[PDB]
């Protein structure tokens with residue numbers, strides 16, 4: 001059974017899309033980025049990877065082997081704090097109007113990164129009774145694609161596996177890894193998946209995806225995985241990116257996302273106006 | 287020769303107008319954030335009347351019998367002035383209410399709010415004693431969940447209150463918007479202060495209702511009502527929860543889920559085969575496959591499944 005598709009600039013996010021996402025754990029969104037923004041983010045992506053090779057450092061960068069013959073960077077962490085177009089991407093109103101419907105009005109940006117890879121699994125940050133807490137799709141990985149992902153080389157999902165118990169999840173994944181539907185993507189498209197959805201990929205050309213994860217503040221507040229202070233800082237981060245993007249004249253015609261969480265969840269005055277967009281998870285863990 | 291003469295004289299709180307707009311993104315937002323949503327005009331006039339008369343019938347029954355079976359009474363029924371205030375399992379007791387429980391606008395809204403694996407849980411009618419009803423103290427409805435706000439502050443466990451009688455501002459429900467996200471300390475403190483004090487509506491909003499209107503509230507939203515007189519104020523309440531939440535956190539046994547799914551499908555079907563509702567686009571109930579359980583047990587012969595018999 002196919003992965004539902006939202007042509008976002010054509011229809012908006014329809015109830016059917018929302019329902020598809022909640023049931024199957026995944027949703028394909030076509031044409032998120034305009035031609036111009038796609039190129040801007042492609043370029044920021046290009047420069048960040050180049051700088052990783054030249055500056056063979058592991059600062060916020062995952063390497064296959066130590067910068068050893070055949071070593072390569074495959075991931076940069078906190079890319080929103082590293083490139084101006086990506087920070088502005090983090091405040092994209094179509095993306096965030098979607099995240100608001102799916103995660104709720106108390107959404108906060110958690111992980112942000114860019115993966116450029118050269119196993120079936122769920123993503124991390126699991127809770128006790130994870131399916132009880134977020135089988136419905138409240139903790140969401142936003143994959144914004146800079147390069148094509150053809151059926152040869154794309155992520156595969158097992159729909160509805162976001163409601164699977166631990167035992168069946170583990171048993172099925174072990175079978176699958178020892179020995180499904182594809183998200184076939186064009187640049188500027190967005191893949192949304194529930195972190196509880198079993199996904200994975202099987203000999204191809206380098207691909208780039210920017211990942212934004214989102215959680216409800218009230219889930220973080222009570223269950224983690226971050227510390228309580230973290231909520232307010234990522235709220236400033238979200239508000240800053242929306243601000244930055246709003247003040248950019250190529251985006252002047254966009255109606256900015258109106259971030260309005262419940263009163264008791266507004267925590268951005270709590271701290272002084274932040275210096276950085278980078279907040280290391282290990283420094284804000286519980 | 288005949289003259290052939292012709293005879294003389296002769297000649298030869300946000301509001302959703304569900305049937306007007308549909309359920310909009312702003313409506314879902316407002317419900318998620320404030321813990322409350324008014325839906326105007328849920329019922330046709332004809333269905334409202336059918337449901338009003340089923341309500342009267344049930345109330346009349348409670349008085350006739352003074353049974354404590356499925357009925358909450360102010361005092362023991364043998365006592366002077368004792369009255370009934372709530373009847374349980376009204377969906378089993380009255381065919382127009384079972385069909386109401388399959389109402390496609392209601393369920394499509396619930397599906398957007400509670401999710402695709404929604405199941406119906408509590409079903410009842412509440413009404414007060416028009417000679418005078420005591421104050422409804424500020425309270426949350428029972429969730430039974432640890433970390434309740436983490437689990438459903440966003441509004442996944444929901445009371446749908448369908449109004450048979452008007453609830454004007456001088457006789458209606460009040461609630462504190464966004465109190466569905468309050469931690470236990472704030473909620474407990476705030477509720478205690480309000481209840482030890484005289485009735486006071488500041489920081490609260492009223493739920494002002496015409497008959498056939500629908501009040502959606504998050505069970506974590508603090509609510510209450512002032513002492514009132516002169517109106518019977520009947521409300522039919524359907525609660526809904528997600529199947530995967532019940533499955534893992536309760537409060538019901540795992541078996542309950544499949545049975546209530548059967549109840550839901552049964553109600554949807556008889557509403558479909560009802561001539562009065564043929565023009566309706568019937569609700570298409572489609573939960574995730576690993577949570578379809580409505581074949582796990584033999585065909586249900588009833589719509590009533592007593593909570594204490596399916597508790598975990």
Ligand code: NI
Nearest residue numbers: 121122123199
């Ligand atoms: Ni992953």
Ligand code: NI
Nearest residue numbers: 425426427509
């Ligand atoms: Ni109540």
